[PDB]
């Protein structure tokens with residue numbers, strides 16, 4: 032019902048950070064918010080806005096897209112749980128994997144200057160400077176763009192650039208409030 | 217040498233090396249010596265060729281964090297104690313160490329101006345990073361980081377340990393040193 036559902040999702044999801052009863056709590060939550068309705072871009076937009084204090088149109092579309100793995104324009108239960116696992120309790124690897132996906136605006140496998148300009152602006156002229164810093168202080172093949180390895184493998188040795196890219200993630204305050212209310216931590 | 221590694225393993229405040237590892241480190245100190253004492257220059261070379269450090273300011277602050285008596289010499293004791301934190305420190309000892317490195321003027325706060333100097337070493341780009349560091353780390357909202365600000369931030373997000381410059385060795389450098397100096 033809710034507990035049979037929790038069972039099936041704990042069994043099948045590639046979510047790594049939540050116990051099964053925490054999963055049950057996240058299903059109850061999904062249903063209280065929707066009530067049969069499939070969670071779509073609008074509703075997801077409000078959750079990011081009201082519960083997690085994201086303001087930018089472009090940012091919130093990009094977050095919606097990273098959660099919507101299957102690209103059907105709905106965050107299923109599975110995608111809610113999976114995305115919330117990363118989004119609230121993600122390891123560095125997952126966060127960077129997610130951030131790269133948030134930032135790669137055409138899915139070519141690389142973050143270009145133009146991409147990096149647009150996404151750092153909306154996340155946050157020092158934005159242009161930052162874009163040159165990141166490119167300079169990261170890659171082996173300096174070709175004005177950053178492969179997935181260049182992003183991940185570099186940020187490891189300049190932390191503060193992580194945090195410019197990590198406005199695609201909730202601040203500490205939003206996460207504790209959410210985790211408190213919904214999960215009970 | 218054996219006798220010396222006993223006296224030093226007894227007296228040193230080091231927490232990670234065995235007594236035989238201390239002996240190897242003593243032998244390594246003597247083999248790297250040029251003059252009679254380990255100075256800035258030799259230490260500069262050691263950081264560079266063994267731990268791949270290039271940036272003169274952080275190398276300076278590292279030398280300073282090792283040389284705890286302020287005499288411009290890494291004594292035997294200081295070498296052993298520093299490498300203990302540097303290679304094998306716990307997260308608490310490393311936060312203590314990296315704060316000391318980043319607090320340039322030793323007043324107990326990592327200021328806006330200090331953060332600026334370190335990240336710089338393109339100006340509106342740096343100015344943004346400084347503001348980003350404060351928004352994550354400055355809990356007491358005084359526009360500078362006390363020990364409490366910094367550690368609270370690192371305990372939450374360990375990547376910030378070295379937020380303003382590499383002042384600890386990477387993994388490869390570390391293991392190469394453990395092998396050829398101590399024996400993996």
Ligand SMILES: [Mg+2]
Nearest residue numbers: 101103105107
């Ligand atoms: Mg979907």
Ligand SMILES: [Mg+2]
Nearest residue numbers: 135137139141
């Ligand atoms: Mg791209």
Ligand SMILES: [Mg+2]
Nearest residue numbers: 285289290291
């Ligand atoms: Mg000394």
Ligand SMILES: [Mg+2]
Nearest residue numbers: 319320321325
């Ligand atoms: Mg200071």
Ligand SMILES: [Mg+2]
Nearest residue numbers: 360361362365
């Ligand atoms: Mg402060």
